[PDB]
Write a protein that binds this DNA or RNA. Structure first.
Lengths: 134, 218, 260
RNA sequence: GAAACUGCGAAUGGCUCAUUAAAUCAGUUAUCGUUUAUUUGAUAGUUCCUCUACAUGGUAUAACUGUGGUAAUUCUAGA
RNA sequence: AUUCAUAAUAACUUUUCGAAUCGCAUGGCCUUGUGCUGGCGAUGGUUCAUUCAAAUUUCUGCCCUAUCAACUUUCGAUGGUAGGAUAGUGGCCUACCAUGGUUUCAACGGGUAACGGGGAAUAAGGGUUCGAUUCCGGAGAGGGAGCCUGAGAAACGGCUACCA
């Protein structure tokens, strides 16, 4: 393969969020696919963007290969890129960390078990220790 | 028949065990609020006077103030009364409860000391416990320490100490209902807002009236 | 059913929101405010489905709650604050001003305006009354009430509230020879001049309106909104100036568009 | 920043079609026959007063500490 | 279209409301007192309007059955007056008094394997059949009744009683 080409269309400036929104389309006549991080770096060197401050999220390849169309947006000043952005995408680009939590059933069971305790249960714990002691 | 004794002068609490039917016979047919003597219940309790406060039967149901006929009856309890705590607004469960007249079927009876005897108790009179929390309102601070109206009670507040693992530091309650420049400023703003709005209304009404008189000069 | 209603499903939203019937099973449900939800436009619809600024619901939540979008010169944070007709929604970080004026076809339009003229707003005075303590007060279609109006402001008429403190400036009468917007029923969004008003006692005084191109029609008086002298409206009219083209010449001009 | 007090919500949803034959329901009116938290807009110089806190009145009570019963309940008793 | 809006007089009331709340800012004045004043907001607050609603409501429209031709009024059925009760109209109830009200233009009764509508099938038409079911409206949480809280519930992932 010789090259892909990335064209940005319908560019909208959104100063309400300090960002620019656009529809990327890439012509990759040979390779297979997009290699999305290469597009992030390419859009970084297109405007001036420091590629950890960009995010392209929507992508789908046209029928019969070659053309892939998606939606992508650039934030200036990567602090706002961490600010006005959903957490799943920031984890997806490695600029955040996924928290681990128990699954929905365990959380619901724990909430509906400590709905049966009034107060801290320190009196209940002390009382049950004393009352099964003798 | 266990006996939960309390001494509220120092706030000490204990449990005692009496297992003779004849040394407990004086306790029968008294409601809560009555007063008994410590003579026939114990030679250790000579001179002590008790008030009957509460208790629980063999099944563990409590006793309710007021109800006679020392049996178990079901009552529809509402908010802000003993023996019940509501789960949502206006809930009134029918709970079963025991009569306040003390009979032989009681399992635990709880008493309050009202006059200490000539001798003392090892775990009750000797033991004393501090109150957990000092006063929080500023006038309650003044009433607790017996202070003046010009005393600046912020310096009398109790500062409880604590060590995290080594680095000791103290904390003190935030005083409530205090004279403060913020409150005086807010009161000043309230007065100024009222008078300014009223004057604006008066002058706009005068302008409307003179406009009407100007219009009706035809 | 035991109380009020808080949900508004898709297929039950107002049709002129142009909400896609798939991709979601609920509609914004404009919360209570100045306008009826059947004839309003929430902030989320305006900012999400018209200017394409936000993409999700939380996106426009984060746009609004940074204290940006002002409706009638007052900061709104609610996603479904019901911005209605003749409202003057403004955006600070882009230095842009808007005015909700109905499109010719019937739904809401996005009418850009200068910074001047965005400091006033017309309102159809709907009932004038001697209020409490003997003061007179007018109340218009947008829920505004104004105390001490001029005695010549009568019912079904138009006043001009600016934005600053109310304080109604020069107002309009209601007769023949006056430009008129229409905001309800089949003849929605059509601008013309009153030629005749027939008053039926008992209800629904129909109005005869003649447009720019001599297509007369009639509406009920509830939908009439007088906007000033013929040829001199006090606002900027939307694109096309409200003509209601028939579909044949709509085809004609649309293929006239095609080709350069 | 747990617990608990306070405020709000829990009267929306979601499910089903047993009842119901001018009943429901649809279009069309009415409220000069009324209730409405909320939202939006306006709105309140007048209060005890012929001896007085206004640089600011008072009580509780939870949570808490520690004392207990009941086989058991989202049981609760007394301090 | 009014005994409307509103205003006035005479009073009346277990005298309702008229801010003892909170955050962020450190401005201004001098008699320099830690004196006077002042911003940007938050939360309440009586009434009126508005919005979300609610509740009653005018006209007209439903499937089969005459082997259902008289029905309603002892125990409100239709109307009058007055009261009570309700958010309020109203026989909604009560006291008294009138003898009315519906119908072969199908009353009343009976049946429904009946929730109603937007709608679906069926391409000459009109029609014949369906609509429990994605939207609108009603009703109900095993059957009934009652009720607290609340702006809004005769609520049942609220309570009480009875029945199974």
């Amino acid at each position: 393969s010789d090259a892909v080409t990335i064209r940005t269309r319908k560019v909208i400036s959104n100063p309400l969020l300090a960002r620019k929104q656009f529809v990327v389309d890439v012509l990759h006549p040979n390779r297979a696919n997009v290699s999305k991080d290469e597009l992030r770096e390419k859009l970084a060197e297109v405007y001036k963007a420091e590629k950890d401050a960009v995010s392209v999220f929507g992508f789908r390849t046209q029928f019969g290969g070659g053309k892939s169309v998606g939606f992508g947006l650039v934030y200036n000043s990567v602090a706002e890129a961490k600010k006005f952005e959903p957490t799943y995408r920031l984890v997806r680009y490695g600029l955040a960390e996924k928290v681990e939590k128990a699954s929905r059933q365990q959380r619901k069971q724990k909430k509906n078990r400590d709905k049966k305790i009034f107060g801290t249960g320190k009196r209940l714990a002390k009382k049950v220790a004393r009352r099964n002691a003798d | 028949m266990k006996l939960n004794i309390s001494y509220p002068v120092n706030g000490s609490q204990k449990t005692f065990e009496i297992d003779d039917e004849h040394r407990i016979r004086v306790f029968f047919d008294k409601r809560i609020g009555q007063e008994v003597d410590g003579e026939a219940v114990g030679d250790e309790f000579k001179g002590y006077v008790f008030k009957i406060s509460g208790g629980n039967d063999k099944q563990g149901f409590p006793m309710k103030q007021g109800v006679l006929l020392p049996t178990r009856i079901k009552l529809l309890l509402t908010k802000n009364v003993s023996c019940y705590r509501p789960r949502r607004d206006g809930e009134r469960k029918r709970k079963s409860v025991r009569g306040a007249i003390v009979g032989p079927d009681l399992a635990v009876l709880a008493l309050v000391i009202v006059k200490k005897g000539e001798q003392e108790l090892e775990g009750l009179t000797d033991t004393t416990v501090p109150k957990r929390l000092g006063p929080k309102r500023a006038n309650n601070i003044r009433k607790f320490f017996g202070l003046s109206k010009e005393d600046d009670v912020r310096d009398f507040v109790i500062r409880r100490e604590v060590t995290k693992g080594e680095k000791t530091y103290t904390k003190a309650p935030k005083i409530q209902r205090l004279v403060t420049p913020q409150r005086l400023q807010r009161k000043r703003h309230q007065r100024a807002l009222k008078v300014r709005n009223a004057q604006a209304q008066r002058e706009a009404a005068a302008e409307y009236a003179q406009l009407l008189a100007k219009r009706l000069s035809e | 059913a035991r109380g009020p209603k808080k949900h508004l499903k898709r297929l039950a939203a107002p049709h002129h929101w142009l909400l896609d019937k798939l991709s979601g099973c609920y509609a914004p449900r404009p919360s209570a405010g100045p306008h009826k939800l059947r004839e309003s436009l929430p902030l989320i619809v305006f900012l999400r489905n018209r200017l394409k600024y936000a993409l999700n619901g939380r996106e426009v939540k984060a746009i609004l709650m940074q204290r940006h979008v002002k409706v009638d010169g007052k900061v709104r944070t609610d996603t479904t604050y019901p911005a209605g007709f003749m409202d003057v929604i403004t955006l600070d970080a882009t230095n842009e001003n808007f005015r909700l004026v109905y499109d010719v076809k019937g739904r809401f339009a996005v009418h850009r305006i200068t910074d001047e003229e965005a400091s006033y707003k017309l309102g159809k005075v709907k009932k004038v009354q001697l209020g409490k303590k003997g003061v007179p007060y007018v109340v218009t279609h947008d829920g505004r009430t104004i105390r001490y109006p001029d005695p010549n402001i009568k019912v079904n008429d138009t006043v001009k509230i600016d934005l600053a403190s109310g304080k109604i400036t020069d107002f309009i009468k209601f007769d023949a020879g006056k430009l008129v917007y229409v905001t309800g029923g089949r003849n929605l969004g059509r601008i013309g001049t009153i030629v005749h008003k027939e008053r039926h006692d008992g209800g629904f005084d129909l109005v005869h309106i003649k447009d720019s191109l001599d297509n007369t029609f009639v509406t009920r008086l509830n939908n009439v909104f007088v906007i000033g002298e013929q040829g001199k409206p006090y606002i900027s009219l939307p694109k096309g100036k409200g003509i209601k083209l028939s579909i044949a010449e709509e085809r004609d001009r649309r293929r006239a568009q095609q080709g350069l």
